[PDB]
Write a protein that binds this ligand. Structure first.
Ligand code: SAH
Ligand code: ZN
Ligand code: ZN
Ligand code: ZN
Lengths: 5, 429
């Protein structure tokens, strides 16, 4: 899902 | 709706979020309470199930012994959701292993049953309205969704009233397309959640806002000046990688191709894939070959961390870094990737010196490849600072911690609890 990493 | 903002139709990007007032760097655009959320298994005992508060002395649920709360109040408030798993966990015992996505989707169905009306999490966009990309779904993805549905029926049939298979495929597609992972100050995975109003924002590789979390509350703050009429963009992915990689991930997971300034101009691609300045410069095909190798080792390592030992993982990192270093510069993002993975392995082994050693090599290229305010950069500075502090190096530690604070004040807001904790760390030592 939407994550920065 | 939401003050100073509005839903609108963004040409070529479906529905989006638009500003109706100016926003300055660090300003809070809006907050969104989680519609549905689940704490990841590995963080149980560290965080409260209900509010995600990180604390010592959390009270254990007497029945399942696998849920922890701040107090009896958090326990009670969490029960409508926890009951979906409490007895099932003890009954299935070791066999209880649904994926996080399934757990979240179960909680979504439960919320839909209890509260079918529009929630305060849906002021601009409703869960029912989520884009699914059902029509774009290939066989591999339909098979994965079917496995997920089967797991849902397998572990959650006790309290849930299921729609037909078609609606479940739609729901699962919506969850994959709009779901958020929640990370802590170190970008460590905490859990998964639905934030409908937040999911309205479209993607850009040069976003003007960042999403952070305050317990289960999502917060959206500007990292660039926003003027009335401008669309509000957030980043869905890790912005370290070059354009092709980024778009491969966006196409695979979100079914679209980005056309932002970064993807069009490709400005940072050269520096991201920096080549060594050798007497005999490396041929084009040798570059393409090493890039291909780099993506392959990234995927290979991804698989290997599930079953290989820490020494084997470090071997893969060292050896791959060695092979890549003949062509790629240390500032090259694939080198950085391996270095970061290796740092993680060192950290697990409680080899603090090695982790510091790698992080020092990682931090500056991160600063140059990532946008001005980046959680990845702040998080790296924070890790470095905590390692320095743990290793009794207060000046270097204080410096790195203050760099982290400096970014986080913008992204999380000056009054965020994470910053209070960091300042407490600086003052205590
Ligand atoms: N930069 C972009 N260009 C084209 N489509 C985008 C985009 N960023 C996000 N999207 C679309 O938005 C979806 C993410 S959920 C974002 C809200 C969505 N636009 C909606 O109408 O509900 C993705 O599936 C993708 O199709
Ligand atoms: Zn709590
Ligand atoms: Zn329980
Ligand atoms: Zn882009």
């Amino acid at each position: 899902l939407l994550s920065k990493r | 709706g939401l003050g100073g903002l509005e839903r609108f139709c963004s040409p070529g990007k479906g529905r989006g979020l638009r500003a109706l007032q100016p926003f300055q760097v660090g300003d809070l655009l809006f907050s969104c309470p989680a519609y549905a959320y689940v704490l990841t298994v590995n963080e149980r005992g560290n965080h409260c199930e209900y509010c995600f508060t990180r604390k010592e002395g959390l009270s254990k649920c007497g029945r399942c012994k696998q849920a922890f709360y701040c107090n009896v109040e958090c326990q009670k408030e969490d029960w409508p959701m926890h009951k979906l798993e409490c007895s099932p966990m003890v009954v299935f015992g070791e066999n209880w292993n649904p994926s996080e996505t399934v757990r979240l989707t179960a909680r979504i169905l439960a919320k839909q049953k209890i509260h079918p009306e529009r929630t305060p999490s849906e002021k601009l966009l409703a869960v029912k309205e989520f884009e699914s990309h059902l029509d774009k779904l290939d066989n591999e993805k339909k098979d994965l969704i079917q496995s997920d549905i089967a797991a849902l029926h397998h572990f959650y049939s006790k309290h849930l009233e299921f729609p037909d298979n078609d609606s479940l495929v739609v729901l699962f597609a919506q969850v994959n397309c709009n779901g958020f992972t929640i990370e802590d100050e170190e970008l460590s995975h905490l859990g998964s959640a639905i934030f409908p109003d937040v999911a309205l924002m479209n993607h850009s590789c040069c976003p003007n806002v960042i999403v952070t979390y305050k317990g289960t509350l999502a917060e959206v703050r500007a990292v660039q000046e926003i003027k009335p009429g401008e669309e509000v963009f957030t980043s869905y992915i890790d912005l370290l990688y070059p354009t092709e990689d980024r778009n491969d991930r966006l196409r695979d997971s979100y079914f679209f191709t980005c056309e932002c300034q970064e993807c069009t101009t490709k400005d940072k691609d050269k520096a991201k894939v920096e080549i060594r300045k050798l007497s005999d410069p490396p041929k084009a095909e040798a570059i393409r070959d090493m890039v291909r190798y780099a993506r392959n080792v990234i995927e290979e390592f991804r698989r290997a961390k599930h079953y290989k030992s820490p020494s084997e993982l470090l071997e893969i990192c060292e050896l791959s870094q060695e092979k890549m270093s003949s062509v790629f510069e240390d500032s090259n993002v694939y080198m950085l990737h391996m270095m970061y993975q290796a740092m993680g392995v060192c950290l697990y082994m409680q080899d603090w010196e090695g982790a510091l050693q790698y992080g020092q090599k990682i931090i500056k290229p991160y600063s140059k490849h990532y946008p001005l305010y980046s959680l990845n950069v702040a998080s790296m500075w924070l890790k470095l600072g905590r390692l320095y502090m743990g290793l009794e190096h207060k000046a270097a530690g204080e410096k790195a911690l203050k760099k982290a604070i400096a970014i986080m004040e913008v992204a999380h807001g000056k009054d965020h609890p994470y910053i209070s904790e960091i300042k407490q760390e600086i003052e205590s030592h």
